[PDB]
Amino acid sequence: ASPQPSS
Amino acid sequence: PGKVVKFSYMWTINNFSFGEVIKSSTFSSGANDKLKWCLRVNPKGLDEESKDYLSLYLLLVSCPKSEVRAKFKFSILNAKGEETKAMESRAYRFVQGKDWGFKKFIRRDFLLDEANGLLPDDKLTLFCEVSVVQ
């Protein structure tokens, strides 16, 4: 549920 | 020069129900509008893990130096104008061309249920608030 990059 | 250090961006996607991406218009902050941002949405998910979700990311399109550190919050504005279904980031380190966000931001079946009031007139309105700390 933490932010992550899309790539 | 002065700097826009906090900003809130509101984006309405029409006819929503209609790994592929929709990108928002570019919006500016910082000194002399030199930080450039956009939202990226995957309406049908980033991948297999997130097939059932809309994915939502904040992308640093342009910046003058190496990096920007920023905190951010995404939410949906409902048929009444109220913020709902918020998710928020600490500050994250962005570099130009890189993004941060939520691959499982909201379930598609919830969003598409008219009972929830999240797609009035089949429009999705997203709201992104950003605070740039470096």
Numbering used by the authors:
A (entry chain B): 3 to 9
B (entry chain A): 26 to 43, 49 to 119, 121 to 165
Direct quotes from the study:
Speckle-type POZ protein (SPOP) is a ubiquitin ligase adaptor that binds substrate proteins and facilitates their proteasomal degradation. SPOP is composed of three domains: the meprin and tumor necrosis factor receptor-associated factor homology (MATH) substrate-interaction domain and two dimerization domains, bric à brac, tramtrack, broad complex and bric à brac, tramtrack, broad complex and C-terminal Kelch. Among the regulatory signals that control Pdx1 stability and function is a degradation pathway wherein Pdx1 associates with a ubiquitin ligase adaptor, speckle-type POZ protein (SPOP). Notably, neither SB motif in Pdx1 conforms to the established SB consensus sequence, but high-resolution structural characterization suggests that the Pdx1 SB motifs share a binding mode with other substrates.
